[PDB]
Write a protein that binds this DNA or RNA. Structure first.
Ligand SMILES: [Mg+2]
Ligand SMILES: [Mg+2]
Ligand SMILES: [Mg+2]
Ligand SMILES: [Mg+2]
Ligand SMILES: [Mg+2]
Ligand SMILES: [Mg+2]
Ligand SMILES: [Mg+2]
Ligand SMILES: [Mg+2]
Ligand SMILES: [Mg+2]
Ligand SMILES: [Mg+2]
Ligand SMILES: [Mg+2]
Ligand SMILES: [Mg+2]
Ligand SMILES: [Mg+2]
Ligand SMILES: [Mg+2]
Ligand SMILES: [Mg+2]
Ligand SMILES: [Mg+2]
Ligand SMILES: [Mg+2]
Ligand SMILES: [Mg+2]
Ligand SMILES: [Mg+2]
Ligand SMILES: [Mg+2]
Lengths: 158, 45, 392, 322, 117, 240
RNA sequence: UUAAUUUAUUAAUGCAAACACCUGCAUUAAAAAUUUCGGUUGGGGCG
RNA sequence: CCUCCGCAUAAGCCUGCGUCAGCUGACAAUUAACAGCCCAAUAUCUACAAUCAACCAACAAGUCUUAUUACCCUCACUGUCAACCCAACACAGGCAUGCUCAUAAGGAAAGGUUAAAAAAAGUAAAAGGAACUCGGCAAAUCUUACCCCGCCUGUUUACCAAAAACAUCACCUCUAGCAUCACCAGUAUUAGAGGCACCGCCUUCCUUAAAUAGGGAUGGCUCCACGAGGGUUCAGCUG
RNA sequence: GCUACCUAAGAACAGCUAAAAGAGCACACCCGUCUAUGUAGCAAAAUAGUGGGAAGAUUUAUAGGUAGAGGCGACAAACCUA
RNA sequence: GCUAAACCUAGCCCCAAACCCCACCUUACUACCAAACCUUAGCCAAACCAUUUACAUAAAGUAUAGGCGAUA
C-alpha cells in the first residue's frame, strides 16, 4: 500500500497505488501430517518450498516472521508436535515408513512442552493457559478432613 | 410554519438513538464510549 | 428455473478454521470462554438433544417415522378440497350415476297441502329477513353470520312440523360430527374425512329410493371419464393416513343413521367460497362417505353389492343458493368401473331468493326497491321441507 | 363514557351491585321422553361424539356445554311446540347479541376541566345469550305493575368503580336480538352458558360457595333486565315515558352441569334521577338456587339425572302469551 | 425527549406498555389466543411455620448480656459438626460423615443455588 | 438497508403470491432504476416456463387441459391455468388458447415434422421450418426465456445438424440446439400494442412514476460527443 | 469546457504471469480528481 | 352571548387547577372485562376479487391451511390520572381516527371610563357609475365576446415567483438477445435512456370623443376542452 | 420524528348533479390565487376574507429505507430538523 | 438611604514520586429458546499552486534532500 509519481517523475502527480501478489491455489502434501492441503499460495512461496526441498522442510525451517501465516504456524505446530510425540498415527501399520519420516525431519524435533506453544497468538496462549489452570475448587470438606487427620496423627504419635 | 420538526414517537426514538442501535456498530460504540468518558448521565436516548 | 433466490436462501456457514484440518493438534476455541470471540477458533458443537422434545418446544419427528405412515399414498378429500372437474370427478370417484331433479318419492311428500306449513311464506320471509338484515346491529350482516342463521332457522321451521308428523321426534341435528371413509377405485385408495357440520341423525334408516330393477339398470350406464385430468386431481395426496372406517360416533349411539348432511359455504370472500359445481361435488363426496361408513359398520368391510342400499341426503347452501342431493349407496365394490353403480339425485342452483336489499335504493329521492328479499322462491323451500320430511 | 356492565361477571356481590344499577328487587322462589332426549344430548356431547382433537378443560365449556345447550334448546322447542303453539312461531336465536343502554343516577365530575359539573351515570350491557326465544306476543305478567314488595333494593354508597367496573365510550345500542323491524320482538326465554373463566371449581377455590349463586344471580339480573328493557324501548317506552304494562322474561343460566332459573319483570324504565325521584315501582327478579342436572357422567351413563331441572326448563318453555 | 427519567412501562405506545413489566417474576406462559396458562410450580409457595407456642419475640430484653460477634466460618462449622464424628471413627468414604461429592441429585443444591433465600 | 427479496418462495404453487414492490431500489435502499414506484397492489402467479415438465414418477409426452385463460398483472401476455394428470400450473397462453382446449407437451423429435398445432410444445427439431414459435429456450431444459411478451412470435428459420436458427422478434438470429423445446404460435394478447394509456394516472396505476435526475453523474445526462483530432480542432465549430 | 496536470479507480484491449479467474505492466477511453483566472488602460465596444 | 365545537381512542407527555396548610410542602390517586403482552412443530394446502354481490359494469387484476405427531396446567404481567402533545410561552399555528351537526358537550369577545386625531374591521349613502387606477386592486353585482400561451387533470421555488416552467397520455430516436437482491422472479407488443408534445389536416381598417392598448387585413396550419395563466371588451354593479 | 422520494400494511372523502369519470358544483380534508392586516407579529411565514383541488397522478396516521460530492428531486439549484 | 459594595477558602494548576443483593446488548438497566484487521486527508508554508512543506548534551542545523526553493 503505497504511492507513485505519475510517469515516474517527482514533478508529476502523486497517486495511491496498491500492488497485490499473484495468488494461486495449489495442493501440497505434508509427509509429517500425511495429508494433502489446498492452500492459496504465491510463486515466491513455491520457490521457497523448492529451496527448502518440500513443504514440511519449508514449514519447519522458516521462522514465524518469514512465514507470516497463522495457517503456516499451525502447520508448524502440528508437525513439531508430531515429531515430539513420534506419534504412531503417522502412517499406522507402517512403522518403517514412520521412522523414516521422523528421521528425515529429526533435526527440527523439540520438547513437546514447547511444541505445544509454537505459533500460538497471545490470546490463544492465554486461553490455553486458562484451560490448563482451571480447576473446580476442592470442597473445604476435603481440606479440613485432611488437616484434622494429619493433626490427629501428630497427636497420636506424640 | 416551521419549528415543529420534532414529532415525538418512542418507537422512532428508541430505534434511532437507543442503546441497542448504538451498540450495533463500532461507530455507535465509540459514541457511547465518548459519552462515558465525558461522564454523561444519559449515555443513550 | 429454480424458485427461491440465493439472497433469500439460508446463508452458507463460514468456512472451518484451517486449524481443524491439521491432524495432530487440538484447536483452541472459545468454547471454554462460553462466549464468542473473533480471535479464537469456532467450536464444533455436538448436536443438542435435550430440546425439541419438551411440549411447547416440539418437533414432530419426520413423516416416515409416524405410526400411520404408509408407502401406498392415499388420496384424502377433506372439507377444504376443491375438485377441478367438480360433479364429474365426484361421480367418477364415488362410482355414481347422476339424475337431474330430486326423486318423486321425496318430492311428493310436500304436494299435499297438509305438510305445507301454516303461514309458511310469512315464516320463511321472516327467517330470511332476520338472517340478512335484522340479525345484528350492523346494517349489513356478513355471510359468515347469515348462512348458518338461515340454515338453522329453516331447520327449526321444518322441525315445527312435529305436529303433523310425530315421527320427527326420532331425530336430532348434531354439530361438529366427523366421519371417515376409505375405498379403492382402480387401485387408487381414496379417503374422505368429512367434518362439515349439522348432520341430521335419525333413529331409523332412510327408505331406499331406487328399486332393484333401476339399480341393475345402472350397469349399462357408463361412468363418464375425463382426460388428461386424472380423477385424483385436487385431492390431498398423503402418505400418513388411517384406513379405519369411522362413522363419527361411538358404538351404541342413538340416532345412528345419517339422514341429512347440511353443508354451508359461509366464507365471506368469493375465492374462499366453493363454486356451485365444487360444492355439489363436496356434497356428493360427503354423502358417499357417510353412507359408506354406515355400510361398513352395518354389513362389514366387504366389497359387495348392497342388498339394502344406504340412503343419505345432503343440502349444500351458500345462504342464498341451495343444492339438494339424495345419494343411494347400493354397492361397496368400488374398485371396478363395471357393475351396479351408486346413484344420486341432484337438484342444482335452487335459489331461495335472487337478491336481498339491505338498504332502500333511492334514485332522485325516490325509493325504487324496498328493503327486503326480492325474487323469493317458495319452491326451493318446498324442496328443503321435502328432504327434511323424507323418512317420516 | 359509560360503565360496561357485564352480566357474566367475576366481581363479588355483583348481584347486589346490579340490583342497584337496575332498581331490581331479587326474590327467592317463584312468582319421560323429554328425559330421554336430555340424556341423549348429554351423552352425545360428552361420550358418543368422537373428537379428533383432544378436548382441554380450558375449552370444555365452549366445545361441550355450548353444543349441549344448543341441542337441548332446539330439540326441546321442537318437542314442546305441539304443547305450546306460540313456541312454534317463535324465533330461536343462537348467540344473537342483546344490548341495553340506560342512565341510572348522577355524579359530580371529580376532576379535570369539567370538575364539579353534574354528569349522568350511563350503563351499557352487551350480552350474547347462548340461546334465546323471541315471540311476537308478549308473555303474561308475573305480578301486577305497581306491585309493592317489602324487600328493599340494596343501597350502594361507593362508586361503581369500586366494584371492578370500568367506563368506555362506544356505540350505545338497544337490541333485543333483532332489529326493530322484526315482528318477533318480545322475549320468551334466555339460555346462558357461564364461561370457563367462571367455573364452579375456580370459584370454589378462590372465594366462598355463596359466590357461585352470586354469579348466577348477577348474570340473571343483568341479562334479563337488558332484554326486558330493550323490549320495552322497542315498544316505545323510556325513562320519561315509563312502561304501562310490565315486561316479562325468563332465563336459565347453566355452567353445563348446574342450572338456575330466573323470572324477571321490568316495571320501570324511569331509572334516571329526574324520572325516579318519585317513582314507587321497581323491577322484580325471582330466582332459584343452582341445582345439578346430573351428578356425573361415567362412560355411557348419566348418574343422578335430576328430573326437576328438566321440568323447570319445560315449564319455562311451556309458558305462553295470553 | 426526556432522557433522564427512568424508562418504565407507562411511557411507550400500546405495544411498549404491554411488553415491559415492573419486575414481577413470571408465573406461567401465553398460549394461542393470548390465553395465559399459570403454572402452579412457578408460583412461589410461602412456607410459613406454625407460630403457636413460639417463645421468641420481635425484640430482646435489654437485660440480655452483651457478647462478642463471632461470624460462623467453614472451619468452625466443620469443627462443630464433623470433627467429633471424624475423631470418634478415626480412633476406632466421607459420605458417612456428611460430605456429598456432588450437589446434583439434591432438591436444595448449594451451587449453583436453586432455592429461594 | 434491511431489504430481503420477496422472491423467497421455494416450492411452485398456483396461488398468487404477495409480491413486494421495489420502487426501483437496490437492496442497499438507493434508487437503481428510475421511474418505478406505486401502482396497484399485485400478486405474482408463478409461471412454469418449462412446458415439457413431466410430472413426478412420470415421463414422455403428455397432454393438458386449459382450465382457464386469465389476465396477468405481471406480464403483457395473458396466462393460462392448465392442468394435467394430478397437477395444475400456469403457462403463457397463446393467441387462440381457449378454456377447455387440449395442449400437447412432447420431447419427441420425430423423423418427420409434427403437425404444428397452436399451443403445443415440441422440440425445435420437430417443427417444420418457418413455423411461428414462442417461449423459446436457450439451452435444452433451461426454460423459456425468449419470445414471451404479448403477441410476439419468432420464426424457426432453419434446421441443420442438431442446431436450429430462430428469428427473435427483434429480427435477430439465434442458434439453439434442436432438442430445446418451444411452443407453437404467437403469444396471447396480440393487441397489447394498440392499448392507449389515455392519461398519466393510468401509468401511475401501472406503477410507472415520473422521475427526474435519472443519471446521477456530474452534470446529469450528457449525450456522447465526437472528440476532434488535432487536425480537425481548427474546424470543430467554425464561427459564422 | 478544445484551461493546465493526472488515470490512482473502473471499462476495454495488448503484453507478460498462472493453465474461466486472477496478478503485474502498457495504451485508449469513461468517469472523475486537483488547481488557476497576470497587470495598465478602454462607458456605446468587437481592443 | 358565543363555538366545526364537544366526548372518546390513538400518539405524545408524565402527576402538570384532587384534599389539606403555608407558588411551596404534605397527603391521596388510575383496581380489568377495554387494550397490550400470543400461538409446538413438520410438511402438505390454498386459480375463481371488491364494489349491499344478486344482475349490471370492468380494469388498475386486488390479506390469503388442514393431517399426523406432541400437550391439560389456566386468567399472570403492564397501560388506565390531568385543564395534557409539537411550536423557547396559559403561543390566533401543527395535530390521526370514531361518534354528536349543533350540541344533552364546551365556552366568554367588554379591567373601569371617555367618545379626540391617525390606524384596523364593518355597515349605510344623494347625483353619477370606472371618470379611480399600471390594472375594476378592493367592494358591489350580473354578464358578453374575443385574442396570446400551454392540449387537458396534475407538479414546483416549505418562507416574495403557481406560471407560458415541470410532468403528462401520444409520437420519434438510441441502447440491450438476457435469468436467481434492483431492472425482474420480467424477455423486443419487453426494458433502460433521451427528445418532443394530446389530437387532426396539408408540404391601412374596426374598436373610443380621444386607442404607445386590443382585434383584422421536416415545415405550414387546425385551440375540442380546460386555466386563481397573460391581455381586450359589451352590459351590469358598485365609495 | 421536518422535508424529497420509496416500501409494508391502514384509514378518510357529506350532499346534489351525473353514471363506472385523473367528470361538474360543493362540505370535511388538502392547497395557498388575490387583497387587507401583522412585520420583535398570535406566528422565526400567522390571521380574515377571497380562491384552487376535493374518488384521485388525492389526502393522511403508523413503522421501515435512501446520508453529504452523497441522497432525493413531475429541475424550483427543490428538499435533506427553522 | 436604597441598590449595592467588599471578603477567603471551596477547590484547582504545574512538578516530583509511585505503574493505576437484583437488573442491564431485546425498545439497555427487561428472570426463562435452536461476528474485527485495510496508506489518513486536508487546513497551512511556498506570499497563487500543481512536486514539496505541514500528523540528555555534542557532532549539527553538519553530511544530505529539495519546483536545489519554501524548506526538510
Ligand atoms: Mg409526520
Ligand atoms: Mg374577556
Ligand atoms: Mg380597555
Ligand atoms: Mg352612492
Ligand atoms: Mg381610465
Ligand atoms: Mg364598463
Ligand atoms: Mg386618471
Ligand atoms: Mg376582485
Ligand atoms: Mg397547463
Ligand atoms: Mg415561495
Ligand atoms: Mg407546495
Ligand atoms: Mg405565491
Ligand atoms: Mg385601459
Ligand atoms: Mg390546474
Ligand atoms: Mg362525494
Ligand atoms: Mg373531479
Ligand atoms: Mg414532487
Ligand atoms: Mg430551470
Ligand atoms: Mg436558476
Ligand atoms: Mg500558499
Amino acid at each position: 500500500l503505497g504511492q507513485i509519481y505519475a510517469n515516474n517523475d517527482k514533478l508529476s502527480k502523486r497517486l495511491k497505488k496498491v500492488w497485490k501478489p499473484q495468488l494461486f491455489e495449489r495442493e501440497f502434501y505434508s509427509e509429517i501430517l500425511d495429508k494433502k492441503f489446498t492452500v492459496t499460495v504465491t510463486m515466491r512461496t513455491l520457490d521457497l518450498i523448492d529451496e527448502a526441498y518440500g513443504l514440511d522442510f519449508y514449514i519447519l525451517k522458516t521462522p514465524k516472521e518469514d512465514l507470516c501465516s497463522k495457517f503456516g504456524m499451525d502447520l508448524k505446530r502440528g508437525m513439531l508436535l508430531r515429531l515430539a510425540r513420534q506419534d504412531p498415527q503417522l502412517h499406522p501399520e507402517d512403522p518403517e515408513r514412520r521412522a523414516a519420516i521422523y528421521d528425515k525431519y529429526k533435526e527440527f524435533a523439540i520438547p513437546e512442552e514447547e511444541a505445544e506453544w509454537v505459533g500460538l497468538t497471545l490470546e490463544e496462549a492465554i486461553e490455553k493457559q486458562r484451560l490448563l489452570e482451571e480447576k473446580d475448587p476442592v470442597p473445604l470438606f476435603k481440606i479440613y478432613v485432611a488437616e484434622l487427620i494429619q493433626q490427629l496423627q501428630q497427636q497420636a504419635l506424640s | 410554519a416551521r419549528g415543529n420538526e420534532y414529532q415525538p414517537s418512542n418507537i422512532k426514538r428508541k430505534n434511532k438513538h437507543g442503546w441497542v442501535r448504538r451498540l450495533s456498530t463500532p461507530a455507535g460504540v465509540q459514541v457511547i464510549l465518548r459519552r462515558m468518558l465525558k461522564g454523561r448521565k444519559s449515555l443513550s436516548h | 428455473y429454480e424458485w427461491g433466490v440465493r439472497s433469500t436462501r439460508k446463508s452458507e456457514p463460514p468456512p472451518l478454521d484451517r486449524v481443524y484440518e491439521i491432524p495432530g493438534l487440538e484447536p483452541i476455541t472459545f468454547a471454554g470462554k462460553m462466549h464468542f470471540v473473533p480471535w479464537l477458533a469456532r467450536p464444533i458443537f455436538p448436536p443438542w438433544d435435550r430440546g425439541y422434545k419438551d411440549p411447547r418446544f416440539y418437533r414432530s419427528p419426520p413423516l416416515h417415522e409416524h405410526p400411520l405412515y404408509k408407502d401406498q399414498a392415499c388420496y384424502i378429500f377433506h372439507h377444504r378440497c376443491r375438485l377441478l372437474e367438480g360433479v364429474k370427478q365426484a361421480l367418477w370417484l364415488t362410482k355414481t350415476k347422476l339424475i337431474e331433479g330430486l326423486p318423486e318419492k321425496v318430492l311428493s311428500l310436500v304436494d299435499d297441502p297438509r305438510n305445507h306449513i301454516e303461514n309458511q311464506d310469512e315464516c320463511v320471509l321472516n327467517v330470511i329477513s332476520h338472517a340478512r338484515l335484522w340479525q345484528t346491529t350492523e346494517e349489513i350482516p356478513k355471510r359468515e353470520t347469515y348462512c348458518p342463521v338461515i340454515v338453522d332457522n329453516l331447520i327449526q321451521l321444518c322441525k315445527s312440523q312435529i305436529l303433523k308428523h310425530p315421527s320427527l321426534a326420532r331425530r336430532i341435528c348434531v354439530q361438529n360430527s366427523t366421519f371417515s371413509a376409505t375405498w379403492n377405485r382402480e387401485s387408487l385408495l381414496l379417503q374422505v374425512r368429512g367434518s362439515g357440520g349439522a348432520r341430521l341423525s335419525t333413529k331409523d334408516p332412510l327408505p331406499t329410493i331406487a328399486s332393484r330393477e333401476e339399480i341393475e339398470a345402472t350397469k349399462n350406464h357408463v361412468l363418464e371419464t375425463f382426460y388428461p385430468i386424472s380423477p385424483i386431481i385436487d385431492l390431498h395426496e398423503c402418505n400418513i393416513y388411517d384406513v379405519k372406517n369411522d362413522t363419527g360416533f361411538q358404538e351404541g349411539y342413538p340416532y345412528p343413521y345419517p339422514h341429512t348432511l347440511y353443508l354451508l359455504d359461509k366464507a365471506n370472500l368469493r375465492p374462499h367460497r366453493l363454486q356451485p359445481d365444487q360444492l355439489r361435488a363436496k356434497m356428493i363426496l360427503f354423502a358417499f362417505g357417510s353412507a359408506l361408513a354406515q355400510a361398513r359398520l352395518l354389513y362389514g368391510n366387504d366389497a359387495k353389492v348392497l342388498e339394502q342400499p344406504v340412503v343419505v341426503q345432503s343440502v349444500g347452501t351458500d345462504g342464498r343458493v341451495f343444492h339438494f342431493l339424495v345419494f343411494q349407496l347400493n354397492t361397496t365394490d368400488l374398485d371396478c368401473n363395471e357393475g351396479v353403480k351408486n346413484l344420486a339425485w341432484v337438484d342444482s342452483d335452487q335459489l331461495l331468493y335472487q337478491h336481498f336489499w339491505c338498504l332502500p335504493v333511492i334514485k332522485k329521492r325516490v325509493v325504487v326497491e324496498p328493503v327486503g328479499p326480492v325474487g323469493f322462491k317458495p319452491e326451493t323451500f318446498r324442496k328443503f321441507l321435502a328432504l327434511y320430511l323424507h323418512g317420516a | 363514557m359509560k360503565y360496561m356492565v357485564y352480566p357474566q361477571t367475576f366481581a363479588l356481590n355483583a348481584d347486589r351491585w346490579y340490583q342497584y344499577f337496575t332498581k331490581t328487587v331479587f326474590l327467592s322462589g317463584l312468582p319421560a321422553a323429554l328425559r330421554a332426549v336430555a340424556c341423549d344430548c348429554l351423552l352425545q356431547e360428552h361420550f358418543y361424539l368422537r373428537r379428533r382433537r383432544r378436548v382441554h378443560r380450558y375449552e370444555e365449556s365452549e366445545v361441550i356445554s355450548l353444543p349441549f345447550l344448543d341441542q337441548l334448546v332446539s330439540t326441546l322447542v321442537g318437542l314442546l311446540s305441539p304443547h305450546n303453539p306460540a313456541l312454534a312461531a317463535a324465533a330461536l336465536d343462537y348467540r344473537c347479541p342483546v344490548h341495553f343502554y340506560w342512565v341510572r343516577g348522577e355524579e359530580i365530575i371529580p376532576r379535570g376541566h369539567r370538575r364539579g359539573r353534574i354528569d349522568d351515570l350511563r350503563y351499557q350491557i352487551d350480552d350474547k345469550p347462548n340461546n334465546q326465544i323471541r315471540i311476537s306476543k308478549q308473555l303474561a305478567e308475573f305480578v301486577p305493575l305497581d306491585y309493592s314488595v317489602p324487600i328493599e333494593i340494596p343501597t350502594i354508597k361507593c362508586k361503581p368503580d369500586k366494584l371492578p367496573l370500568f367506563k368506555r365510550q362506544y356505540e350505545n345500542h338497544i337490541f333485543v336480538g333483532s332489529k326493530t323491524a322484526d315482528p318477533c320482538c318480545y322475549g320468551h326465554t334466555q339460555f346462558h352458558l357461564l364461561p370457563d373463566k367462571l367455573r364452579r371449581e375456580r370459584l370454589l377455590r378462590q372465594n366462598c360457595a355463596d359466590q357461585i349463586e352470586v354469579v348466577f344471580r348477577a348474570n340473571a339480573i343483568a341479562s334479563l333486565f337488558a332484554w326486558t328493557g330493550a323490549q320495552a324501548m322497542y315498544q316505545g317506552f323510556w325513562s320519561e315515558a315509563d312502561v304501562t304494562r310490565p315486561f316479562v322474561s325468563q332465563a336459565v343460566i347453566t355452567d353445563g352441569k348446574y342450572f338456575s332459573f330466573f323470572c324477571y319483570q321490568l316495571n320501570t324504565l324511569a331509572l334516571t334521577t329526574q324520572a325516579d325521584q318519585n317513582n314507587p315501582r321497581k323491577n322484580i327478579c325471582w330466582g332459584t338456587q343452582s341445582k345439578p342436572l346430573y351428578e356425573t357422567i361415567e362412560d355411557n351413563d348419566v348418574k343422578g339425572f335430576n328430573d326437576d331441572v328438566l321440568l323447570q326448563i319445560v315449564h319455562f318453555l311451556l309458558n305462553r302469551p295470553k | 425527549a426526556d432522557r433522564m427519567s427512568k424508562w418504565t412501562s407507562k411511557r411507550g405506545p400500546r405495544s411498549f406498555r404491554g411488553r415491559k413489566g415492573r419486575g414481577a417474576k413470571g408465573i406461567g406462559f401465553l398460549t394461542s389466543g393470548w390465553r395465559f396458562v399459570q403454572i402452579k410450580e412457578m408460583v412461589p409457595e410461602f412456607v410459613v411455620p406454625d407460630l403457636t407456642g413460639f417463645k421468641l419475640k420481635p425484640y430482646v430484653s435489654y437485660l440480655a448480656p452483651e457478647s462478642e460477634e463471632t461470624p460462623l466460618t467453614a472451619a468452625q462449622l466443620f469443627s462443630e459438626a464433623v470433627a467429633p464424628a471424624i475423631e470418634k471413627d478415626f480412633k476406632d468414604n466421607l459420605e458417612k460423615y456428611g460430605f456429598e461429592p456432588t450437589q446434583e441429585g439434591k432438591l436444595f443444591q448449594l451451587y449453583p443455588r436453586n432455592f429461594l433465600r | 438497508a434491511n431489504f430481503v427479496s420477496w422472491k423467497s418462495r421455494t416450492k411452485y404453487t398456483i396461488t398468487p403470491v404477495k409480491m413486494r414492490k421495489s420502487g426501483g431500489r437496490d437492496h442497499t435502499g438507493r434508487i437503481r432504476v428510475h421511474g418505478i414506484g406505486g401502482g396497484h397492489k399485485q400478486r405474482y402467479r408463478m409461471i412454469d416456463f418449462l412446458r415439457f415438465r413431466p410430472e413426478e414418477t412420470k415421463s414422455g409426452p403428455f397432454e393438458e387441459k386449459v382450465i382457464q385463460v386469465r389476465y396477468d398483472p405481471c406480464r403483457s401476455a395473458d396466462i393460462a391455468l392448465v392442468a394435467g394428470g394430478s397437477r395444475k400450473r400456469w403457462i403463457i397462453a397463446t393467441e387462440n388458447m381457449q378454456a377447455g382446449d387440449t395442449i400437447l407437451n412432447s420431447n419427441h423429435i420425430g423423423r418427420m415434422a409434427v403437425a404444428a398445432r397452436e399451443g403445443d410444445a415440441h422440440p425445435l427439431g420437430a417443427l417444420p421450418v418457418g413455423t411461428l414459435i414462442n417461449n423459446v429456450e436457450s439451452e435444452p431444459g433451461r426454460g423459456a426465456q425468449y419470445i414471451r411478451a404479448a403477441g410476439t412470435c419468432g420464426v424457426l428459420l432453419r434446421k441443420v445438424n442438431g442446431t436450429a436458427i430462430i428469428q427473435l422478434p427483434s429480427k435477430r438470429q439465434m442458434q439453439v440446439l434442436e432438442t430445446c423445446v418451444a411452443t407453437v404460435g404467437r403469444v396471447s394478447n396480440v393487441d397489447h400494442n394498440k392499448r392507449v394509456i389515455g392519461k398519466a394516472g393510468r401509468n401511475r396505476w401501472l406503477g410507472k412514476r415520473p422521475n427526474s435526475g435519472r443519471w446521477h453523474r456530474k452534470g446529469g445526462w450528457a449525450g456522447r460527443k465526437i472528440r476532434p483530432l488535432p487536425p480537425m480542432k481548427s474546424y470543430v465549430k467554425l464561427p459564422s
